[PDB]
Amino acid sequence: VDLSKHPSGIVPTLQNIVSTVNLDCKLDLKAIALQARNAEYNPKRFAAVIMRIREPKTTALIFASGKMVCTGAKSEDFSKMAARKYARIVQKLGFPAKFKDFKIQNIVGSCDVKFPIRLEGLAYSHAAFSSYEPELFPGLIYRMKVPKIVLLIFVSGKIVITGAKMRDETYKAFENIYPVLSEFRKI
DNA sequence: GCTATAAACGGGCA
DNA sequence: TGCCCGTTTATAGC
User: Fold this and answer.
1) CA of A99 and C1' of B2: distance in angstroms?
2) Would you say the C-beta of A108 is within 7 Å of strand B?
3) CATH of A113-183 among 3.30.310.10, 1.20.58.220, 3.40.190.10, 3.40.50.300
4) Nucleotides of B under 7 A from a protein CB
5) Cis link prior to A134 (omega < 30° from 0)?
């Protein structure tokens, strides 16, 4: 384990990637839904052709403007790969699709400090960052400021980390919270 | 299933 | 304007 960005020795698994990209062409979603078998289009419910591929297991959202969203991938490149696959499926249907302005929009990762946490004690000494109402949701909602990352901390020691645009913020935010979570170990 | 979280999207509606 | 819906994913306690 690389103990330079991970002094803890713990590495958050990335669990979901959300990305955008501009096909930079106007599209007929009604037509796309007809010749593609992989596509569902409910213009009332959501003005988007919803498309999926098996590897990388992803779901895409394709809007007439030409903007496209890709979700479900386990990493940044994996997400890019899927978006490339979707853009080419579109090209194959006779549309001047390109691959303009690809952007990693959100990283979601999870990890495990491997010990229980007193969520109340954590929520009590960090009132400015925390939000813990275990009747609505069993997880503490910790909005870190540097970096601006949102952590979801639980009793078991399992942790969700979201709102990251670079995977180093996913890693930094956890590293920031680890010596805090040890402070409130549940014995 | 709903409860919560981040984020892109575009149509709809107060 | 703004807010919802829309998709995905870890988490887990009703």
Assistant:
1) 37
2) yes
3) 3.30.310.10
4) 3-11
5) no
